[PDB]
């Protein structure tokens, strides 16, 4: 089953994108009113006839203080996606890429570590705000050099959704996403991104472990120690 993680800042369209991939209203996407979801959600479904697992994330990828809540939510993120994501689905609201999305790119690296960008697919929400203009023409021509680095680091793997789109318009934009993920799956030969904390999470959930050596405090502690490794190795530039 194809494992996908929705990443990005709050309000860019992670939940709506996950709802349009699965074709169901399953992740909370409020319009204006107060939200309830504070933690990672996982929903299994079918997408283009292929079985899919989608992990939606809270505000893990934003300016924030180091607290138990952060590591609980990064911890749930690896638990749900174990043994690791095939695709990291980085959601950018088209037209609105600001300092916070730049911060979100930084913290995608800090959460997942070295090698995670080989598995990233940009997904531009608000395709409709692009006028009658082409997406390839937009990405080549934006005055946003933070965005253009991200496109070159993702090897030009990127797509656009109208999450409020019609049935036809939803069908079309799912096929164009499949094309990107097909091409990514062949370039990775079916590989999923992984590190020790993914591996540590995989062993923790698999039945037949029969020790319960590790604990929800100990796991969340391993989560913190892993992210600081990512922060060391990334301060080394
Ligand atoms: N018009 C339009 N609205 C969108 C799109 N994607 C998301 N939204 C809206 O943007 C708001 C925030 O989106 P949401 O999925 O909750 O973003 P999240 O904070 O990353 O989970 C929601 O009310 C959505 O209805 C899109 O492609 N087009
Ligand atoms: Mg959401």
Swiss-Prot record:
Tissue expression, as annotated, is: Widely expressed with high levels in lymph node and spleen. High expression found in T lymphocytes, including CD4 and CD8-positive T-cells, and monocytes. Very low expression levels in B-lymphocytes.
What's the main place this protein lives? membrane
Q: Which residues lie on this side of the membrane: Cytoplasmic?
A: 1-237
Q: How does it sit in the membrane?
A: Single-pass type IV membrane protein
Q: Ranges for the AIG1-type G domain?
A: 1-202
**One GO MF term attached to the UniProt entry:** GTP binding
Please state where this protein is localized.
Lysosome membrane; Endosome, Multivesicular body membrane; Endosome membrane
Q: Which UniProt keywords apply?
A: Endosome, GTP-binding, Lysosome, Membrane, Nucleotide-binding, Transmembrane, Transmembrane helix
Kindly state one GO CC term assigned in the UniProt record: multivesicular body membrane
Impact upon substituting residue 178 to P: In NCPH2; uncertain significance; strong decrease in protein level
Q: Where does GTP bind?
A: 8-16, 29, 126-128, 163
Task: Name the associated disease, please.
Answer: Portal hypertension, non-cirrhotic, 2: An autosomal recessive disorder characterized by portal hypertension associated with hepatosplenomegaly, in absence of cirrhosis. Portal hypertension is defined by a portal venous system pressure that is at least 5 mm Hg higher than the pressure in the inferior vena cava. High pressure in the portal venous system leads to shunting of blood through vessels that are poorly suited to carrying large blood volumes, resulting in collateral circulation and splenomegaly.
Family listed: Belongs to the TRAFAC class TrmE-Era-EngA-EngB-Septin-like GTPase superfamily. AIG1/Toc34/Toc159-like paraseptin GTPase family. IAN subfamily.
Q: What does this protein do?
A: Plays a role in T lymphocyte development and the optimal generation of CD4/CD8 double-positive thymocytes. Inhibitor of GSK3A, possibly by sequestering GSK3A in cytoplasmic vesicles and impairing its translocation to the nucleus. Consequently, impairs GSK3A-dependent transcriptional program and regulation of the DNA damage response occurring during T cells proliferation. Required for the survival of peripheral T cells, natural killer (NK) and NK T-cell development and the maintenance of normal liver function. May promote the survival of mature T lymphocytes upon cytokine withdrawal.
What does the record note on quaternary structure?
A: Interacts with BAD, BAK1, BAX, BCL2, BCL2L1/Bcl-xL and BCL2L11/BimEL. The interaction with BAX is increased, when cells initiate apoptosis upon IL2 withdrawal. Also interacts with BCL2. Forms a complex with BCL2L1 or MCL1 and HSPA8/HSC70; the interaction between HSPA8 and BCL2L1 or MCL1 is impaired in the absence of GIMAP5. May interact (via N-terminus) with microtubules.
Protein name, per record: GTPase IMAP family member 5
Species of provenance:
Homo sapiens (Human)
What's the source species' lineage? Eukaryota, Metazoa, Chordata, Craniata, Vertebrata
């Amino acid at each position: 089953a194809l494992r996908i993680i929705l990443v990005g800042k709050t309000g860019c369209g992670k939940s709506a994108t996950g709802n349009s991939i699965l074709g169901q209203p399953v992740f909370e996407s409020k319009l204006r009113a107060q939200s309830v979801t504070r933690t990672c959600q996982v929903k299994t479904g079918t997408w283009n006839g292929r079985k899919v697992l989608v992990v939606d994330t809270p505000s893990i990828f934003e300016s924030q203080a180091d607290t138990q809540e952060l590591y609980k939510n990064i911890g749930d993120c690896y638990l749900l996606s174990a043994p690791g994501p095939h695709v990291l689905l980085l959601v950018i609201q088209l037209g609105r890429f600001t300092a916070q999305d730049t911060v979100a790119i930084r913290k995608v690296k800090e959460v997942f570590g070295t090698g995670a960008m080989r598995h990233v697919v940009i997904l531009f929400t608000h395709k409709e705000d692009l006028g009658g203009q082409a997406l390839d023409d937009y990405v080549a021509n934006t005055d946003n050099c933070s965005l253009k680095d991200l496109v070159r680091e993702c090897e030009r793997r990127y797509c656009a959704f109208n999450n409020w789109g019609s049935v036809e318009e939803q069908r079309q934009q799912q096929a164009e996403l499949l094309a990107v993920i097909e091409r990514l799956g062949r370039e990775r030969e079916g590989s999923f991104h992984s590190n020790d904390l993914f591996l540590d999470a995989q062993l923790l959930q698999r039945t037949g472990a029969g020790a319960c050596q590790e604990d929800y405090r100990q796991y969340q502690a391993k989560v913190e120690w892993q992210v600081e490794k990512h922060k060391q190795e990334l301060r080394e530039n």
